[PDB]
């Protein structure tokens, strides 16, 4: 651990207000922006609860020290930066509201699926009777048993 004191590494949930302001230094944040992850004992500890926004909408023009993570050097990394990376989940505002999206998409899906059902109920079939194959519907050639002759299926003219 080259140059890392325990107090320069994370610690326990900041209980007293002086500890919440000490941690905010460790993490190079503003003391009024350090909002520890809720204390429900799932391990987060003192790690800052940074806004859940993906690196996708981090200004795409600024010279980010780490270009591809669109993260500067020192800025507190997000807990789930392994998911909000540009190559994965996005949380980038969308011109259409999310609900509107979910409803519309699935509506389409449902209407389609349904209409397809209306279809199977009412199919489209030309005015043509059934096709007629010779012999006994090709009983033997459809691989039928040579020994056992089939009930003759005959087809008459017109």
């Amino acid at each position: 651990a080259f140059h890392m004191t325990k107090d320069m590494l994370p610690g326990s949930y900041p209980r007293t207000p002086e500890e919440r302001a000490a941690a905010a230094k460790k993490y190079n944040m503003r003391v009024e922006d350090y909002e520890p992850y809720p204390d429900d004992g799932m391990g987060y500890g003192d790690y800052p609860m940074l806004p859940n926004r993906s690196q996708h909408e981090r200004d795409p023009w600024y010279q980010w020290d780490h270009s591809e993570l669109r993260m500067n050097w020192g800025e507190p990394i997000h807990w789930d930066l392994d998911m909000y990376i540009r190559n994965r989940v996005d949380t980038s505002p969308t011109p259409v509201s999310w609900d509107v999206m979910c409803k519309h998409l699935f509506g389409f899906v449902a209407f389609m699926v349904f209409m397809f059902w209306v279809g199977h109920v009412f199919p489209s079939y030309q005015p043509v009777g059934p096709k007629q194959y010779p012999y006994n519907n090709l009983y033997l050639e459809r691989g039928g048993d040579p020994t056992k002759e089939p009930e003759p299926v005959v087809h008459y003219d017109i």
């Binding site: 080259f2 140059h3 890392m4 320069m8 590494l9 994370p10 610690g11 326990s12 949930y13 460790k26 993490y27 190079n28 944040m29 503003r30 009024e32 922006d33 429900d40 004992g41 799932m42 391990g43 987060y44 500890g45 003192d46 790690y47 859940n52 926004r53 020290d65 780490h66 500067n72 050097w73 020192g74 800025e75 507190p76 990394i77 807990w79 930066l81 996005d90 949380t91 980038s92 505002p93 969308t94 509201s97 999310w98 609900d99 509107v100 999206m101």
Partner: protein, 127 residues
Amino acid sequence: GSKYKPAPLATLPSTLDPAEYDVSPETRRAQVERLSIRARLKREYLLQYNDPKRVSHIEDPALIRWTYARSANIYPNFRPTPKNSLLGAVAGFGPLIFWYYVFKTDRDRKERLIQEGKLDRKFNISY
């Protein structure tokens, strides 16, 4: 007149964010300050990476505080509550018990059928 409606995804854009438009003097003071923390950190990366005569690895300790927080500062901050042990048993034994009654029932259906003589097992000369 549809109003954009940020969801945990598809969040509220910068514009259309009421907070941003109106802000108290204190707020500006914050922002004017947060830049300072960043500018400070920026001028602590930019004259150590642009330093001639350097071979050592710029460390990015903000990433080292992240990994330690995520794989070596977890169990020292574990307190067994409810919503954690109920949810810590449904996850380990829940499906593990689900599939057992999925595989037992199938394996038992199969065995019965084989025993009674129905399963065809045709052209199956391998297993």
